[model samples]
Target: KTPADNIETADLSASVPTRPAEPERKTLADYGGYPSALDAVKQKNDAAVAAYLENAGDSAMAENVRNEWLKSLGARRQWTLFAQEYAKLEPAGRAQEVECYADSSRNDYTRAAELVKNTGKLPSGCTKLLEQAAASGLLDGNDAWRRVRGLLAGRQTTDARNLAAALGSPFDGGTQGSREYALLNVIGKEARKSPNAAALLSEMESGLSLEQRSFAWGVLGHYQSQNLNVPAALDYYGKVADRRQLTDDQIEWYARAALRARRWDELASVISHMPEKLQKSPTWLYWLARSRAATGNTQEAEKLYKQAAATGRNFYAVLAGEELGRKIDTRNNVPDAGKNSVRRMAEDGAVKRALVLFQNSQSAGDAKMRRQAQAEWRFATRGFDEDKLLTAAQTAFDHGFYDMAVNSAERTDRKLNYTLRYISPFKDTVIRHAQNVNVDPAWVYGLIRQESRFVIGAQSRVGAQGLMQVMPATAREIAGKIGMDAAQLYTADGNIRMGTWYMADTKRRLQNNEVLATAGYNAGPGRARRWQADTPLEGAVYAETIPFSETRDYVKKVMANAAYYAALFGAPHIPLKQRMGIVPAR
Candidate 1:
């Protein structure tokens, strides 16, 4: 029998082991049919849950079910049962809130605090853990202040106030002489958007303590940096006495402020103090190298340049390659899977189940089942070796799951497969439209890859739709300009045609600069133009200082993808640095 026939006729539901001693019982749910078992767990039907667990042993789905059950037990204050179930569960599936509950139950306030502190919008159990930790003096005034600072930064005002009150530092408005009113006053102000906030804050400094003043300045600097008020943000950041007290985002803005002003000394200091993980990123690596060179440290600069370039031909890598006067390596790394690879992966139990679910969901048009299929596919391939992952990627690609193919291909450790990672599924359609619109097809493909990863039915929370992720408003305007029906935006041909036209137009409006155009595409044209430096600046530096983190990263990735795609398409090898060029002063 064909695989499809086998899957269709096979009693997948009976795969789950039933209670052998019981007779005349209800038919069991399939192991792949997670919703039935999930419903049983949620309903807390212990007997049915036990049978389901027996059938779904060691599966990722089972881990999720156990996690839900643990939460149920914790909510009921059944610590004994919760502990037993949680201990039996695998480490990966243990939720942080559950861990906090377990820790709080054992009176381990330190661990509980460590888990929940600096987090916002946590579960009830985690909230209790934080309160208990504060009561136990585990989260002291400074730690509590840090927590409040982060919560405020995250805009969780209610949570910040509640936690502050719990820690004996209520945010209630106090008498004019006391620091309470001043604290509340700053917290209540529209500091995030108020242009005169810095001056107002300066006038009220005498009413606040050292910590309060520091928090005030840090927050002001954070907001101002986001607004692209570079000089003022630098001034506000300079007023911050205890820089270490700055929140993570605030600290990042501090670095951004310095980078915007070309203050290499300040940039070097801030980058040095960056979280180790951020420091190791190619973005920071390239910037630090530039800062080191600006500060007359050539040897360290060259060393860092080499380090960044070695990472891969990403945005910074290409820039670093230019700095080192070396051509960026553009070779494709395609691995040869053994002849039996597809058959071997197809025979995997998880793969078989995934296939059945995927095909059934597509046939029946079931969104929930589609989600389950994706989850099962991810869980099934979680432990695959490099070759196995490549095989799975090929399988996914053959099945027309382009997004999953790219995802799996990109996850490989050392064996690079650019062909799989950068699949141009609608190459002819994309290229034809791109050429018609006078834009490089490589750039168009790069944008689409980042936008939807080649998913035909992709949609964003912000109302972007289809392969190119054109917004409804954007689709309407572009369709009108192209003299096509707006409803056709969901189709591959229509989307690419409109999207390419928009891309080319945006570039024309933005000094013909691809980096700025890319940023404008993600953000808006006004903001991209407004972000231009007061003096002419390198494109890389301008991108590094972009106010919105999303737009900054989006521009970088799109441009980098363009470079790689250009090479893959055998286009002229224009240096990425030259492609970036310089952004004119505002």
Candidate 2:
């Protein structure tokens, strides 16, 4: 029998509910113009969506259909029907615009005001909501000025002027000759030249209001923070009349600046006032705990550290664990996907559909098809408990779907499955090349996990290729040096060899510091070296303060992954703190 026949006859003994069979199980191969639900929206035909939904039961695209229908209803002023249909949507299906429209339709102006408060450019639904909120006095002049400042900083001059006028506080900064305009140009062009843009800003303060003045100083403070002038940044940040006007980046840098300056009291305040979500992130959680401990609040600090340390295997989690005197657990616990359960999962309609999609996408070499299959897998297993998710992950792994296996394995909250989460494919080749460069194989594996997720032919948007993400130019350069052709980069063997060699070389050039090397790998060596402080910095501080956000986060994750991989490999127990040792003064 064929593979399809085998799947059709797979055991279904597990206690999962069964739904009515659709025509050929709703596989995309059997469906045509699947996402034409989008076209139905473009045509402005509600009837089209209704008809599509009738035949699209239990399909992932059904949510797309309803989302478009909701938007169309709001646009056409069908508030009664919009409210009725919007209530039926799942929580995940409620997009931001949908929420704004719902709140506006219900006359919940307070909610609408908060929703549109921080955005530089409002969505269509949010645009109406903000106007109504401003007109109803739910949002005040301070709110309008905040958005205006954000828009101006984003270089959206017309948007800033328009929003100000719409809110009944017309701005005079439209003309190039206005004092505000001059201040804007100075901040844009000269803020980085000298840390004292306050001098130029003061010269143009004659016609500027306190709001605009605060915004200008905030902008100067952000630039100084970017330049690593922590003291100057703090001074400018303190001069702002309304700290609420500070952008997300400005607030984060304010915190980072306070952090590097060791102003524990101020850091506590900064973290305390962060948006609820940001304040609760693992990074801030650890820092807040540190600030509390430094300020002699040992009891509160211990509780906060335990909270952060329990989050996951992230960089902040490791540091927090260390602070609490806990060892990071790297014990392998592969959940046993019994043969019967694997068969039961294979019999699952979603799994069957996903399997076909994967097979066809791989055979036909279609990226869009692979993406559709991935979405199906995600939607299918979204509600699965730990046991079911592990079974599904095992089925994917047995079928050679490494990416999907890792995706499913990573979702299990309990019943930990490190084998699936950190599947080390091409083990012999990776380890042999790592040995050639005298680099730790665990670090190599960690880097590969982030680079490609073990996708052998993975291609990055910036032209990096293969399992190791080597760029074409660098691949050729290394190819010449190693007596191999650049075409060899397409193979795992050549990519691993060249990548390990490059990483080893970078580590040596960057004072043999893995943290710096990791940053240099993602960004360039020159920028990584330049980010070093005049004084020594704890590796965490250096990682946190790197100017490039991507490199900063990348360094943290790669190092964290190395710690876990080291554990999985049964290597020596090097604490994460030692792995990320102090960066020497530049």
Candidate closest to the true structure, highest lDDT: 2
TM-score of each: 0.85, 0.85
Off by over 4 Å in 1: 1-81, 84-88, 109-128, 165-184, 187-189, 310-313, 332-334
Error of 1 at 373 (Å): 2.4
Worst 10 residues of 1 by lDDT: 10-19
The residue ranges of model 2 lying beyond 4 angstroms of the native Cα positions read 1-26, 30-32, 35-54, 65-89, 101-113, 120-124, 172-196, 203-213, 332-335, 412-415
Tens digit per residue, CA lDDT, model 1, 426-475: 88788898999789888898899999988776778897887888888988
* Sequence-dependent TM-score of model 1: 0.85
Clashing pairs in 2: none
TM-score of 2: 0.85
lDDT of each: 0.75, 0.78
What are the per-model numbers of colliding residue pairs?
Answer: 0, 0
